[PDB]
Amino acid sequence: DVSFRLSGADPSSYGMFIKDLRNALPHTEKVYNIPLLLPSVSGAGRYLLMHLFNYDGNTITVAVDVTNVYIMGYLALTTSYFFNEPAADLASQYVFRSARRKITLPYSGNYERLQIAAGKPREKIPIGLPALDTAISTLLHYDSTAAAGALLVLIQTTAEAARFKYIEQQIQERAYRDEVPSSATISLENSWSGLSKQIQLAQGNNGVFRTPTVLVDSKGNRVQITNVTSNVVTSNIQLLLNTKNI
Ligand SMILES: *[C@@H]1O[C@H](CO)[C@@H](O[C@@H]2O[C@H](CO)[C@@H](O)[C@H](O)[C@H]2NC(C)=O)[C@H](O)[C@H]1NC(C)=O
Ligand SMILES: OC[C@H]1O[C@](O)(CO)[C@@H](O)[C@@H]1O
């Protein structure tokens, strides 16, 4: 399991938690020197338990599918919550089994369904460690609408940041002050599946993408990524979704 405590949190420890998070996802091959997540993992080995603690010491344990880094649900005190999606329901059969009760959330884990439940897109949701501390708290006490929001904060704080070095940086900049994600942050999140597929097709295409990826950069300008030499691939992305799952 991996852990992060906000009490005393700073860019340094958040860095370590996100480093641990990356270290817990299994791979057996690297593509252009970037861990390639497994196609599948059978059983309970498929789920990683993150222990998160809000500033007052309360905790939630989040379950993550180690082959894609999708959050499946979480345990808050003695209740468990899982998205309304097949993978989550399957996941429910291996984790938080001893929860006194299980709540299926009213919506699957997609950013689209989550934003509708929350009443706003992510573009308007402040993130940062403080925001992550509100999220831990919100989820300790079931509220479907507030959870939609807390969950968009949680996924980004933890999954996207593990997947992208740039996102981890955005959060470290937001250690004591939340702020809506830069649009390049939203682009990366949206292009992960695609970059992952393209980093892999390039393997036998001399490092060239079969299809380019359109991104938004630091300045807010639209750039096209067409080969492995880009900074997105050399520095930025830290994990790849196996094409067997794309
Ligand atoms: C691979 O992408 C690189 C950019 O990352 C391309 O090289 C650059 O492309 C033009 C010059 O032709 C400029 O806009 C960049 O500043 C160049 N960068 C560098 C460092 O040289 C390259 O052409 C792409 N290759 C393919 C096959 O698409
Ligand atoms: O936008 C939908 C996507 O949002 C995520 O929660 C985070 O990347 C994924 O589980 C899903 O594919």
Side-chain angles (χ1 to χ4, degrees), residues 4-8 51-60 133 136-137 140:
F4 188 39
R5 298 178 162 75
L6 271 99
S7 195
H51 298 298
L52 307 185
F53 297 73
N54 72 5
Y55 181 86
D56 303 319
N58 299 325
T59 189
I60 61 163
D133 181 57
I136 308 136
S137 300
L140 287 161

Side-chain angles (χ1 to χ4, degrees), residues 103-176:
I103 299 191
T104 290
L105 312 161
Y107 46 67
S108 76
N110 170 40
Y111 277 139
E112 287 180 353
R113 288 303 195 177
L114 277 162
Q115 290 171 166
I116 279 302
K120 36 185 64 185
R122 278 162 297 119
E123 285 82 347
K124 313 228 211 299
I125 306 170
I127 59 170
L129 298 185
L132 172 59
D133 181 57
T134 298
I136 308 136
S137 300
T138 282
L139 302 169
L140 287 161
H141 294 121
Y142 183 58
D143 186 316
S144 88
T145 307
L151 288 172
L152 286 162
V153 178
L154 185 82
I155 287 290
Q156 289 178 282
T157 56
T158 54
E160 306 299 3
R163 297 169 179 153
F164 304 93
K165 208 152 256 185
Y166 171 83
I167 307 305
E168 153 173 37
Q169 280 159 19
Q170 293 258 287
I171 298 166
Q172 286 170 309
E173 276 165 27
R174 298 160 169 69
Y176 313 117

Side-chain angles (χ1 to χ4, degrees), residues 12-245:
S12 199
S13 60
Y14 172 65
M16 299 183 267
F17 146 69
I18 284 299
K19 170 177 193 299
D20 298 331
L21 174 51
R22 282 161 187 154
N23 283 159
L25 308 156
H27 64 285
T28 53
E29 199 178 328
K30 282 206 192 179
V31 170
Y32 286 105
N33 197 42
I34 298 163
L36 184 77
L37 287 161
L38 293 179
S40 58
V41 167
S42 201
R46 193 185 186 85
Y47 309 115
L48 168 72
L49 302 187
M50 305 200 289
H51 298 298
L52 307 185
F53 297 73
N54 72 5
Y55 181 86
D56 303 319
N58 299 325
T59 189
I60 61 163
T61 295
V62 179
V64 193
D65 176 309
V66 308
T67 82
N68 50 41
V69 203
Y70 289 167
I71 288 296
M72 295 291 83
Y74 53 99
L75 162 68
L77 177 41
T78 71
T79 302
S80 59
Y81 311 77
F82 296 90
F83 283 119
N84 195 213
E85 64 180 339
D89 181 49
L90 153 68
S92 77
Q93 320 184 18
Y94 300 90
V95 299
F96 319 134
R97 306 292 308 287
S98 55
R100 284 186 79 254
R101 90 162 138 187
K102 172 182 109 191
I103 299 191
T104 290
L105 312 161
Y107 46 67
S108 76
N110 170 40
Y111 277 139
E112 287 180 353
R113 288 303 195 177
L114 277 162
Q115 290 171 166
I116 279 302
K120 36 185 64 185
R122 278 162 297 119
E123 285 82 347
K124 313 228 211 299
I125 306 170
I127 59 170
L129 298 185
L132 172 59
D133 181 57
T134 298
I136 308 136
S137 300
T138 282
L139 302 169
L140 287 161
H141 294 121
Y142 183 58
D143 186 316
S144 88
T145 307
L151 288 172
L152 286 162
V153 178
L154 185 82
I155 287 290
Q156 289 178 282
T157 56
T158 54
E160 306 299 3
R163 297 169 179 153
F164 304 93
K165 208 152 256 185
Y166 171 83
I167 307 305
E168 153 173 37
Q169 280 159 19
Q170 293 258 287
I171 298 166
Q172 286 170 309
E173 276 165 27
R174 298 160 169 69
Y176 313 117
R177 171 179 91 193
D178 300 329
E179 200 189 312
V180 293
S182 62
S183 41
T185 286
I186 272 160
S187 192
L188 294 170
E189 291 166 6
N190 288 325
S191 292
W192 190 56
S193 179
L195 291 175
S196 291
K197 188 186 199 151
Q198 293 299 353
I199 294 313
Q200 294 159 93
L201 297 184
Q203 264 173 110
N205 195 207
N206 293 313
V208 172
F209 290 175
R210 297 283 180 175
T211 302
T213 287
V214 187
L215 285 198
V216 176
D217 63 18
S218 287
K219 177 61 159 291
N221 294 309
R222 159 215 181 294
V223 57
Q224 272 210 339
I225 311 301
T226 74
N227 63 72
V228 315
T229 61
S230 196
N231 284 298
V232 205
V233 192
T234 59
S235 294
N236 224 342
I237 198 165
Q238 302 297 311
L239 294 171
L240 305 174
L241 178 61
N242 198 302
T243 46
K244 275 165 100 163
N245 298 8

